[PDB]
Design a protein around this ligand. Sequence first.
Ligand SMILES: Cc1cc2nc3c(=O)[nH]c(=O)nc-3n(C[C@H](O)[C@H](O)[C@H](O)COP(=O)(O)OP(=O)(O)OC[C@H]3O[C@@H](n4cnc5c(N)ncnc54)[C@H](O)[C@@H]3O)c2cc1C
Ligand SMILES: Cc1cc2nc3c(=O)[nH]c(=O)nc-3n(C[C@H](O)[C@H](O)[C@H](O)COP(=O)(O)OP(=O)(O)OC[C@H]3O[C@@H](n4cnc5c(N)ncnc54)[C@H](O)[C@@H]3O)c2cc1C
Ligand SMILES: COc1cccc2c(C)cc(=O)[nH]c12
Ligand SMILES: COc1cccc2c(C)cc(=O)[nH]c12
Ligand SMILES: [Zn+2]
Ligand SMILES: [Zn+2]
Lengths: 230, 230
Amino acid sequence: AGKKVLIVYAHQEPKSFNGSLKNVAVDELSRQGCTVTVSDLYAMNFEPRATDKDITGTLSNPEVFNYGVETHEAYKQRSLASDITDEQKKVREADLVIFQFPLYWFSVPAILKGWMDRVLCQGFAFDIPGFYDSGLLQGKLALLSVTTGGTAEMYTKTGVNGDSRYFLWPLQHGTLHFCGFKVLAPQISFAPEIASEEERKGMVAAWSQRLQTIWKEEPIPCTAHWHFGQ
Amino acid sequence: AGKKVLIVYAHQEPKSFNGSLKNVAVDELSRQGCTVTVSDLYAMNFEPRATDKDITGTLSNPEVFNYGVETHEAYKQRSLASDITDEQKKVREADLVIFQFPLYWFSVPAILKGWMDRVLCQGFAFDIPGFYDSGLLQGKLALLSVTTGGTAEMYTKTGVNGDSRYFLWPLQHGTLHFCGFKVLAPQISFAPEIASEEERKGMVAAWSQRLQTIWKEEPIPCTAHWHFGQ
Ligand SMILES: Cc1cc2nc3c(=O)[nH]c(=O)nc-3n(C[C@H](O)[C@H](O)[C@H](O)COP(=O)(O)OP(=O)(O)OC[C@H]3O[C@@H](n4cnc5c(N)ncnc54)[C@H](O)[C@@H]3O)c2cc1C
Ligand SMILES: Cc1cc2nc3c(=O)[nH]c(=O)nc-3n(C[C@H](O)[C@H](O)[C@H](O)COP(=O)(O)OP(=O)(O)OC[C@H]3O[C@@H](n4cnc5c(N)ncnc54)[C@H](O)[C@@H]3O)c2cc1C
Ligand SMILES: COc1cccc2c(C)cc(=O)[nH]c12
Ligand SMILES: COc1cccc2c(C)cc(=O)[nH]c12
Ligand SMILES: [Zn+2]
Ligand SMILES: [Zn+2]
């Protein structure tokens, strides 16, 4: 409906399976009348390193540099690098944030890890206190749309990779829940490089079709039990 | 003696607590007669992004860029960027790789994420297929030395952060095990910033003491059961 979506997208190749998933999301959400923004990290050459270049003002302690202290202070003073504050404005206005990425080492590619490290700073995304259900991005929805090398069978409790939910923990809970997001169920598109033409088409359309009803979903309970069972 | 250690270190500040932990590791291993090499990622301005610049000369398929494929072929045809192959030589020669970093979003800082993404390429670290135990770095030891913001109590199974072992899974299992490493128990230095001066000394001194008999240690069983089970 009347909602803003930010898609944070992390793939080098527009003709990729990730690129297709990002474009069907843009096409489907735009069809519904949503306001849609994409941060295409590699095309923006997004800086992933957390450095002292991310602060442009007088440092709180120029003798011993502490990235988290300095960026928290910079956020309050408005002295963060503008690439960071550009992304913060997108996130502040968004009702839903979708992350579209290939799994790299059971996690996000580094360029996207750098977006989380630098954009989700203290004062903007959380405060101490003001995290988990009290995070500063409360009200907002987030969803991981992930592609894998490994097959769905590999990513089971007794498969070699363990259950797919296990590698979701640091991203869903440690990052998105910590910032206050409600987490929608992940979209995992398994092993598209191995899959047939028709399985690949089906995976694209399953995503497109789920997006038709995304505003009707409830978030997951983003708890240890959900991720690990027991 | 004779062992080679590589320390891959990811902190911006030489006077940091991470910096102190890296420096006692160098002091202690050097005292024992070990060959020691440090990759100081921030001081190297190490590139974290996985891009086509990682291949020199010409591409295996310059119409559709697939990073895994292109870097696999580059590795085989000795055509990877020299920042990558410089790291790979350090890893190839090392008996033990220590990673020293502050926890960022239940994981490694993006600069060290990019080291894993770009250094541990197919053909070097693992083959498809050719992993976990068919994994090309077998024989090597790896150890995560992590500092946290949250206290040990926060990091228990019913604490807000969940168990420490839960965030360890993508690094120890999805990355280090997958590559063939035997994984030594993690060194976790919980919450240095909230001091005291004496307890901080204590944590530096336990790390130094542990490194005294590091070569006597048995690896962990790097299993779903160790990370999640009872
Ligand atoms: C550094 C690194 C670390 C990795 N770590 C892991 C890991 O820990 N665990 C794991 O499982 N995997 C891992 N992988 C594998 C990685 O997750 C997969 O290679 C990636 O998820 C595949 O997605 P893709 O977009 O690149 O696929 P592509 O190679 O782009 O897609 C496969 C095929 O789909 C085709 N296609 C594109 N669009 C469409 C469409 N509209 N309809 C039909 N077909 C289409 C493409 O043309 C291509 O033929 C790793 C890879 C790298 C490089
Ligand atoms: C982007 C980001 C994401 C984060 N995500 C998480 C997360 O997911 N989970 C989490 O728990 N935390 C997280 N943190 C917090 C982070 O892990 C801690 O801030 C960090 O681990 C502190 O380690 P440090 O080396 O920077 O401590 P420092 O601030 O460098 O130092 C601690 C104290 O020890 C002093 N010191 C240095 N050397 C010695 C010495 N030899 N003896 C005694 N004292 C010494 C220092 O001067 C300082 O006073 C995050 C931080 C950031 C910026
Ligand atoms: C290309 O596929 C891959 C590349 C790198 C790592 C993995 C892991 C850790 C599991 C998996 O199933 N596939 C992988
Ligand atoms: C400054 O401390 C922190 C910064 C950013 C994230 C965390 C998380 C996820 C848990 C925690 O205990 N502390 C954190
Ligand atoms: Zn959660
Ligand atoms: Zn394992």
